[PDB]
Point group: C3
Chain length 114, copies 3
């Protein structure tokens, strides 16, 4: 699984340990081994949410399976909770795009996951 | 809706007011309230288009609905127009990926839009 | 085609000529004319792969057609080879999301490709 967060929160406001915490919690939530989880945080962005530039986040989760109505609600609770607690971003100023990928459509290690 | 523009135009060449203009113009175009529009501009990027490093932009629009043949043509004219007028990017050096998202695949406020 | 690479490798470790090499080799691999190939490289990123901050890359390839199981394997071999040779990233620390786009969902030059 691949989780990306783009935010206007400054770099110095991203606490030490954040990438590891995302990795750990997404392994737990998706049920995939942590070795297969990738995370990426992009602070200091020029962005607005609903016309204002208070803290906000635009995110994505790509996964080979483990995407669906109830799963995605659970991911969103987890991820908005982390963004609120660690980055002080209100949950109502977070969007997360969920993308269910076919194995043949994910490249890795000179091939695909097919 | 979520609109992202990645460009090699320098930060100083992005006008004050550009995020607000994008927000207003996208609210009008999608028919959705401004409160639901998120915009993100990423200048100073290392990019090329057709092998050239003249000004260019790589963009995306995600929306729950309001995506389709005619609508996307209209969005492309609007958005290329804004990129030309405000960032001085030629329309033939812009790509916009349109993604129609299901409500269950968009996280927001500790849940999804389903 | 649009190819994006996000990496924790520093900017100074991205060799001169890399965007041009990507452009040329993607044109060949995809069959598409070079004028339609867009490339974007984003160094210095705060990312982890498998919980580790060793060099890694998170990438995407969008194309109107030319996406499929054998093609994607071929792209992955090409692109992981380039990331290994030029950026010193292990192929087993690269993910590439492949997205086959409908022509009507790609904006360019004030319109779409439909
Ligand atoms: Cl996304
Ligand atoms: Cl996109
Ligand atoms: Cl992607
Ligand atoms: Zn997306
Ligand atoms: Zn896309
Ligand atoms: Zn994607």
């Amino acid at each position: 699984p691949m989780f990306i967060v783009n935010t206007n929160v400054p770099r110095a406001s991203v606490p030490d340990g954040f990438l590891s915490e995302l990795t750990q919690q997404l392994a737990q939530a998706t049920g995939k081994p942590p070795q297969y989880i990738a995370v990426h945080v992009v602070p200091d962005q020029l962005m607005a949410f609903g016309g204002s530039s208070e803290p906000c986040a635009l995110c994505s989760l790509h996964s080979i399976g483990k995407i669906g109505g109830a799963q995605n609600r659970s991911y969103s609770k987890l991820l908005c909770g982390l963004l609120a607690e660690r980055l002080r971003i209100s949950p109502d100023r977070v969007y997360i795009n969920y993308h269910d990928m076919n194995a043949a459509n994910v490249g890795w290690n000179n091939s695909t996951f097919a």
